[PDB]
Amino acid sequence: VKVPRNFRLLEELEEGQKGVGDGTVSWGLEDDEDMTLTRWTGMIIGPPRTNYENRIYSLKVECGPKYPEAPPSVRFVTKINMNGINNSSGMVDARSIPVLAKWQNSYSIKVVLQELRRLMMSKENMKLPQPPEGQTY
């Protein structure tokens, strides 16, 4: 048990439940019995005025023993065509996502999801053709 890690992830769990940010991303435990607070799920509402519009993206986020000193691992469940996301596995490439590539220990699951949503509206992603609704990895 690392007290600082566990305190932090309980704070994030509470923030997840209270709602924070602008409402367009959410996060929670993958299984509410995981007292290790390692496996999370995330939601991103697909941004209007992009090809992600009218879709809700499901993600998995893993916060290992070094979190939040070390960045989490992220994978899309919902199929997505987006830079930095392996089109075959759904794994997020940390080096293509600035907040993962340049992780700071003040960052959070929230910040990661917010960053991914921002990148969905970038010119290089926003008009990518997308797989049919409902497909997953």
mmCIF file with all atom_site columns, C-alpha atoms in Angstrom:
data_model
loop_
_atom_site.group_PDB
_atom_site.id
_atom_site.type_symbol
_atom_site.label_atom_id
_atom_site.label_alt_id
_atom_site.label_comp_id
_atom_site.label_asym_id
_atom_site.label_entity_id
_atom_site.label_seq_id
_atom_site.pdbx_PDB_ins_code
_atom_site.Cartn_x
_atom_site.Cartn_y
_atom_site.Cartn_z
_atom_site.occupancy
_atom_site.B_iso_or_equiv
_atom_site.pdbx_formal_charge
_atom_site.auth_seq_id
_atom_site.auth_comp_id
_atom_site.auth_asym_id
_atom_site.auth_atom_id
_atom_site.pdbx_PDB_model_num
ATOM 1   C CA . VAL A 1 1   ? 0.000   0.000  0.000   1.00 0.00 ? 1   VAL A CA 1
ATOM 2   C CA . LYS A 1 2   ? 1.363   3.404  -1.033  1.00 0.00 ? 2   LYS A CA 1
ATOM 3   C CA . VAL A 1 3   ? -0.617  5.938  1.011   1.00 0.00 ? 3   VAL A CA 1
ATOM 4   C CA . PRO A 1 4   ? 0.027   8.936  -1.357  1.00 0.00 ? 4   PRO A CA 1
ATOM 5   C CA . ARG A 1 5   ? -1.035  6.916  -4.417  1.00 0.00 ? 5   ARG A CA 1
ATOM 6   C CA . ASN A 1 6   ? -4.133  5.558  -2.704  1.00 0.00 ? 6   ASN A CA 1
ATOM 7   C CA . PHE A 1 7   ? -5.124  8.968  -1.302  1.00 0.00 ? 7   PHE A CA 1
ATOM 8   C CA . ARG A 1 8   ? -4.804  10.439 -4.756  1.00 0.00 ? 8   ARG A CA 1
ATOM 9   C CA . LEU A 1 9   ? -6.881  7.768  -6.518  1.00 0.00 ? 9   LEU A CA 1
ATOM 10  C CA . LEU A 1 10  ? -9.630  8.042  -3.871  1.00 0.00 ? 10  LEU A CA 1
ATOM 11  C CA . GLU A 1 11  ? -9.675  11.805 -4.557  1.00 0.00 ? 11  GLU A CA 1
ATOM 12  C CA . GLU A 1 12  ? -10.029 11.084 -8.286  1.00 0.00 ? 12  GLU A CA 1
ATOM 13  C CA . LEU A 1 13  ? -12.810 8.558  -7.580  1.00 0.00 ? 13  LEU A CA 1
ATOM 14  C CA . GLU A 1 14  ? -14.689 11.229 -5.603  1.00 0.00 ? 14  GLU A CA 1
ATOM 15  C CA . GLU A 1 15  ? -14.146 13.857 -8.344  1.00 0.00 ? 15  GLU A CA 1
ATOM 16  C CA . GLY A 1 16  ? -15.431 11.311 -10.860 1.00 0.00 ? 16  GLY A CA 1
ATOM 17  C CA . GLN A 1 17  ? -18.635 10.933 -8.799  1.00 0.00 ? 17  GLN A CA 1
ATOM 18  C CA . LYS A 1 18  ? -19.096 14.648 -8.078  1.00 0.00 ? 18  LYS A CA 1
ATOM 19  C CA . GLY A 1 19  ? -18.609 15.612 -11.699 1.00 0.00 ? 19  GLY A CA 1
ATOM 20  C CA . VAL A 1 20  ? -15.801 18.052 -12.409 1.00 0.00 ? 20  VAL A CA 1
ATOM 21  C CA . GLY A 1 21  ? -14.669 19.701 -15.646 1.00 0.00 ? 21  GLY A CA 1
ATOM 22  C CA . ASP A 1 22  ? -17.215 20.532 -18.375 1.00 0.00 ? 22  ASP A CA 1
ATOM 23  C CA . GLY A 1 23  ? -19.201 17.275 -18.188 1.00 0.00 ? 23  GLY A CA 1
ATOM 24  C CA . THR A 1 24  ? -17.897 15.818 -21.474 1.00 0.00 ? 24  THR A CA 1
ATOM 25  C CA . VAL A 1 25  ? -15.550 13.252 -19.928 1.00 0.00 ? 25  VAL A CA 1
ATOM 26  C CA . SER A 1 26  ? -16.113 10.843 -17.012 1.00 0.00 ? 26  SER A CA 1
ATOM 27  C CA . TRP A 1 27  ? -14.177 8.126  -15.189 1.00 0.00 ? 27  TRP A CA 1
ATOM 28  C CA . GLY A 1 28  ? -14.774 5.390  -12.640 1.00 0.00 ? 28  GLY A CA 1
ATOM 29  C CA . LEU A 1 29  ? -13.502 2.023  -11.452 1.00 0.00 ? 29  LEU A CA 1
ATOM 30  C CA . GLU A 1 30  ? -13.813 -0.868 -13.907 1.00 0.00 ? 30  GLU A CA 1
ATOM 31  C CA . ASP A 1 31  ? -14.851 -3.018 -10.953 1.00 0.00 ? 31  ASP A CA 1
ATOM 32  C CA . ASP A 1 32  ? -15.983 -1.301 -7.738  1.00 0.00 ? 32  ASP A CA 1
ATOM 33  C CA . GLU A 1 33  ? -14.414 -4.115 -5.665  1.00 0.00 ? 33  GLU A CA 1
ATOM 34  C CA . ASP A 1 34  ? -10.898 -3.283 -6.945  1.00 0.00 ? 34  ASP A CA 1
ATOM 35  C CA . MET A 1 35  ? -9.596  -1.763 -3.714  1.00 0.00 ? 35  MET A CA 1
ATOM 36  C CA . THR A 1 36  ? -6.227  -1.482 -5.510  1.00 0.00 ? 36  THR A CA 1
ATOM 37  C CA . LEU A 1 37  ? -7.719  1.351  -7.607  1.00 0.00 ? 37  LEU A CA 1
ATOM 38  C CA . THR A 1 38  ? -5.714  0.145  -10.608 1.00 0.00 ? 38  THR A CA 1
ATOM 39  C CA . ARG A 1 39  ? -8.298  -0.461 -13.374 1.00 0.00 ? 39  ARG A CA 1
ATOM 40  C CA . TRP A 1 40  ? -10.465 2.461  -14.499 1.00 0.00 ? 40  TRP A CA 1
ATOM 41  C CA . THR A 1 41  ? -12.908 3.086  -17.318 1.00 0.00 ? 41  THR A CA 1
ATOM 42  C CA . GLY A 1 42  ? -13.349 6.441  -19.028 1.00 0.00 ? 42  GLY A CA 1
ATOM 43  C CA . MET A 1 43  ? -15.931 8.144  -21.261 1.00 0.00 ? 43  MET A CA 1
ATOM 44  C CA . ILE A 1 44  ? -15.434 10.884 -23.829 1.00 0.00 ? 44  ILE A CA 1
ATOM 45  C CA . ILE A 1 45  ? -18.464 12.455 -25.510 1.00 0.00 ? 45  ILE A CA 1
ATOM 46  C CA . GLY A 1 46  ? -17.556 12.748 -29.176 1.00 0.00 ? 46  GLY A CA 1
ATOM 47  C CA . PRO A 1 47  ? -17.075 16.472 -29.997 1.00 0.00 ? 47  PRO A CA 1
ATOM 48  C CA . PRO A 1 48  ? -19.713 18.237 -32.118 1.00 0.00 ? 48  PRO A CA 1
ATOM 49  C CA . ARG A 1 49  ? -18.529 19.524 -35.513 1.00 0.00 ? 49  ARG A CA 1
ATOM 50  C CA . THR A 1 50  ? -16.172 16.569 -35.895 1.00 0.00 ? 50  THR A CA 1
ATOM 51  C CA . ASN A 1 51  ? -16.501 13.050 -37.258 1.00 0.00 ? 51  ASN A CA 1
ATOM 52  C CA . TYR A 1 52  ? -16.585 11.812 -33.632 1.00 0.00 ? 52  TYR A CA 1
ATOM 53  C CA . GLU A 1 53  ? -19.935 13.650 -33.129 1.00 0.00 ? 53  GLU A CA 1
ATOM 54  C CA . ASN A 1 54  ? -22.966 11.758 -31.748 1.00 0.00 ? 54  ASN A CA 1
ATOM 55  C CA . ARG A 1 55  ? -20.791 8.927  -30.386 1.00 0.00 ? 55  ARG A CA 1
ATOM 56  C CA . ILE A 1 56  ? -19.694 8.132  -26.824 1.00 0.00 ? 56  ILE A CA 1
ATOM 57  C CA . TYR A 1 57  ? -16.221 6.658  -26.501 1.00 0.00 ? 57  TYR A CA 1
ATOM 58  C CA . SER A 1 58  ? -15.402 4.042  -23.883 1.00 0.00 ? 58  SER A CA 1
ATOM 59  C CA . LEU A 1 59  ? -11.783 3.744  -22.672 1.00 0.00 ? 59  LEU A CA 1
ATOM 60  C CA . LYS A 1 60  ? -9.722  1.718  -20.192 1.00 0.00 ? 60  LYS A CA 1
ATOM 61  C CA . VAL A 1 61  ? -7.113  3.459  -18.006 1.00 0.00 ? 61  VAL A CA 1
ATOM 62  C CA . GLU A 1 62  ? -4.599  1.628  -15.826 1.00 0.00 ? 62  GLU A CA 1
ATOM 63  C CA . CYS A 1 63  ? -2.929  3.418  -12.908 1.00 0.00 ? 63  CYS A CA 1
ATOM 64  C CA . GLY A 1 64  ? -0.054  1.247  -11.790 1.00 0.00 ? 64  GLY A CA 1
ATOM 65  C CA . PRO A 1 65  ? 1.956   1.240  -8.523  1.00 0.00 ? 65  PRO A CA 1
ATOM 66  C CA . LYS A 1 66  ? 4.009   4.324  -9.463  1.00 0.00 ? 66  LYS A CA 1
ATOM 67  C CA . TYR A 1 67  ? 0.962   6.458  -10.268 1.00 0.00 ? 67  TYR A CA 1
ATOM 68  C CA . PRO A 1 68  ? 0.814   9.445  -10.196 1.00 0.00 ? 68  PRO A CA 1
ATOM 69  C CA . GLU A 1 69  ? 4.589   9.781  -10.462 1.00 0.00 ? 69  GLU A CA 1
ATOM 70  C CA . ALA A 1 70  ? 4.318   7.706  -13.637 1.00 0.00 ? 70  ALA A CA 1
ATOM 71  C CA . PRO A 1 71  ? 1.643   8.223  -16.342 1.00 0.00 ? 71  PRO A CA 1
ATOM 72  C CA . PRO A 1 72  ? -1.244  5.730  -16.703 1.00 0.00 ? 72  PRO A CA 1
ATOM 73  C CA . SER A 1 73  ? -1.738  3.415  -19.662 1.00 0.00 ? 73  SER A CA 1
ATOM 74  C CA . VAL A 1 74  ? -4.751  4.114  -21.858 1.00 0.00 ? 74  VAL A CA 1
ATOM 75  C CA . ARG A 1 75  ? -6.671  2.038  -24.409 1.00 0.00 ? 75  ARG A CA 1
ATOM 76  C CA . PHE A 1 76  ? -9.854  2.778  -26.369 1.00 0.00 ? 76  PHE A CA 1
ATOM 77  C CA . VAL A 1 77  ? -12.572 0.120  -26.193 1.00 0.00 ? 77  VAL A CA 1
ATOM 78  C CA . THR A 1 78  ? -14.672 1.918  -28.820 1.00 0.00 ? 78  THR A CA 1
ATOM 79  C CA . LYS A 1 79  ? -13.096 1.771  -32.287 1.00 0.00 ? 79  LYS A CA 1
ATOM 80  C CA . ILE A 1 80  ? -11.636 5.095  -33.346 1.00 0.00 ? 80  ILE A CA 1
ATOM 81  C CA . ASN A 1 81  ? -9.484  6.464  -36.110 1.00 0.00 ? 81  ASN A CA 1
ATOM 82  C CA . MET A 1 82  ? -7.299  9.055  -34.414 1.00 0.00 ? 82  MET A CA 1
ATOM 83  C CA . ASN A 1 83  ? -3.609  9.946  -34.416 1.00 0.00 ? 83  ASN A CA 1
ATOM 84  C CA . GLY A 1 84  ? -1.756  8.378  -31.515 1.00 0.00 ? 84  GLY A CA 1
ATOM 85  C CA . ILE A 1 85  ? -4.285  5.516  -31.235 1.00 0.00 ? 85  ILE A CA 1
ATOM 86  C CA . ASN A 1 86  ? -3.262  2.178  -32.718 1.00 0.00 ? 86  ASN A CA 1
ATOM 87  C CA . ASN A 1 87  ? -5.981  1.456  -35.272 1.00 0.00 ? 87  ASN A CA 1
ATOM 88  C CA . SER A 1 88  ? -5.701  -2.288 -34.562 1.00 0.00 ? 88  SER A CA 1
ATOM 89  C CA . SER A 1 89  ? -5.343  -2.520 -30.723 1.00 0.00 ? 89  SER A CA 1
ATOM 90  C CA . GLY A 1 90  ? -6.892  0.751  -29.504 1.00 0.00 ? 90  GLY A CA 1
ATOM 91  C CA . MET A 1 91  ? -3.749  1.345  -27.399 1.00 0.00 ? 91  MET A CA 1
ATOM 92  C CA . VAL A 1 92  ? -2.837  5.000  -26.919 1.00 0.00 ? 92  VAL A CA 1
ATOM 93  C CA . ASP A 1 93  ? 0.747   5.849  -27.892 1.00 0.00 ? 93  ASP A CA 1
ATOM 94  C CA . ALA A 1 94  ? 2.068   7.945  -25.006 1.00 0.00 ? 94  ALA A CA 1
ATOM 95  C CA . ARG A 1 95  ? 4.581   9.733  -27.277 1.00 0.00 ? 95  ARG A CA 1
ATOM 96  C CA . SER A 1 96  ? 1.782   11.162 -29.476 1.00 0.00 ? 96  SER A CA 1
ATOM 97  C CA . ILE A 1 97  ? -0.215  12.576 -26.545 1.00 0.00 ? 97  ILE A CA 1
ATOM 98  C CA . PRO A 1 98  ? 1.627   15.543 -24.930 1.00 0.00 ? 98  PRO A CA 1
ATOM 99  C CA . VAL A 1 99  ? 0.219   15.084 -21.425 1.00 0.00 ? 99  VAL A CA 1
ATOM 100 C CA . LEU A 1 100 ? 1.342   11.405 -21.487 1.00 0.00 ? 100 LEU A CA 1
ATOM 101 C CA . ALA A 1 101 ? 4.664   12.093 -23.268 1.00 0.00 ? 101 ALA A CA 1
ATOM 102 C CA . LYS A 1 102 ? 5.383   14.992 -20.863 1.00 0.00 ? 102 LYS A CA 1
ATOM 103 C CA . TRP A 1 103 ? 3.589   13.609 -17.804 1.00 0.00 ? 103 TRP A CA 1
ATOM 104 C CA . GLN A 1 104 ? 3.576   15.662 -14.599 1.00 0.00 ? 104 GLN A CA 1
ATOM 105 C CA . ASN A 1 105 ? 2.581   14.226 -11.223 1.00 0.00 ? 105 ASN A CA 1
ATOM 106 C CA . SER A 1 106 ? -0.072  16.969 -10.911 1.00 0.00 ? 106 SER A CA 1
ATOM 107 C CA . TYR A 1 107 ? -1.901  15.357 -13.849 1.00 0.00 ? 107 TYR A CA 1
ATOM 108 C CA . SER A 1 108 ? -4.835  12.982 -13.439 1.00 0.00 ? 108 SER A CA 1
ATOM 109 C CA . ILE A 1 109 ? -7.193  10.627 -15.284 1.00 0.00 ? 109 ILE A CA 1
ATOM 110 C CA . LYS A 1 110 ? -9.375  13.664 -15.884 1.00 0.00 ? 110 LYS A CA 1
ATOM 111 C CA . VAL A 1 111 ? -6.537  15.598 -17.544 1.00 0.00 ? 111 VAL A CA 1
ATOM 112 C CA . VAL A 1 112 ? -5.733  12.649 -19.849 1.00 0.00 ? 112 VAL A CA 1
ATOM 113 C CA . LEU A 1 113 ? -9.354  12.323 -21.022 1.00 0.00 ? 113 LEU A CA 1
ATOM 114 C CA . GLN A 1 114 ? -9.701  16.084 -21.468 1.00 0.00 ? 114 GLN A CA 1
ATOM 115 C CA . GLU A 1 115 ? -6.505  16.106 -23.574 1.00 0.00 ? 115 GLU A CA 1
ATOM 116 C CA . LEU A 1 116 ? -7.721  13.231 -25.753 1.00 0.00 ? 116 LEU A CA 1
ATOM 117 C CA . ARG A 1 117 ? -11.015 15.102 -26.321 1.00 0.00 ? 117 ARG A CA 1
ATOM 118 C CA . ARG A 1 118 ? -9.126  18.295 -27.272 1.00 0.00 ? 118 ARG A CA 1
ATOM 119 C CA . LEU A 1 119 ? -7.024  16.278 -29.778 1.00 0.00 ? 119 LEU A CA 1
ATOM 120 C CA . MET A 1 120 ? -10.242 14.874 -31.274 1.00 0.00 ? 120 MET A CA 1
ATOM 121 C CA . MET A 1 121 ? -11.047 18.434 -32.410 1.00 0.00 ? 121 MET A CA 1
ATOM 122 C CA . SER A 1 122 ? -7.589  19.044 -33.923 1.00 0.00 ? 122 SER A CA 1
ATOM 123 C CA . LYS A 1 123 ? -7.463  19.607 -37.680 1.00 0.00 ? 123 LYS A CA 1
ATOM 124 C CA . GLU A 1 124 ? -5.413  16.411 -38.167 1.00 0.00 ? 124 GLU A CA 1
ATOM 125 C CA . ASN A 1 125 ? -8.166  14.226 -36.601 1.00 0.00 ? 125 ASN A CA 1
ATOM 126 C CA . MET A 1 126 ? -11.518 15.970 -36.827 1.00 0.00 ? 126 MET A CA 1
ATOM 127 C CA . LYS A 1 127 ? -12.378 14.926 -40.413 1.00 0.00 ? 127 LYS A CA 1
ATOM 128 C CA . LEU A 1 128 ? -10.951 11.404 -40.329 1.00 0.00 ? 128 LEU A CA 1
ATOM 129 C CA . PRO A 1 129 ? -13.566 8.883  -41.548 1.00 0.00 ? 129 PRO A CA 1
ATOM 130 C CA . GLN A 1 130 ? -14.619 6.668  -38.641 1.00 0.00 ? 130 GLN A CA 1
ATOM 131 C CA . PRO A 1 131 ? -15.518 2.948  -38.325 1.00 0.00 ? 131 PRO A CA 1
ATOM 132 C CA . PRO A 1 132 ? -19.248 2.080  -38.074 1.00 0.00 ? 132 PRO A CA 1
ATOM 133 C CA . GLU A 1 133 ? -20.860 2.954  -34.741 1.00 0.00 ? 133 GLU A CA 1
ATOM 134 C CA . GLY A 1 134 ? -20.602 0.245  -32.091 1.00 0.00 ? 134 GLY A CA 1
ATOM 135 C CA . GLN A 1 135 ? -17.354 -1.440 -33.162 1.00 0.00 ? 135 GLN A CA 1
ATOM 136 C CA . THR A 1 136 ? -14.846 -2.185 -30.391 1.00 0.00 ? 136 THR A CA 1
ATOM 137 C CA . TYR A 1 137 ? -11.342 -3.658 -29.997 1.00 0.00 ? 137 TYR A CA 1
#
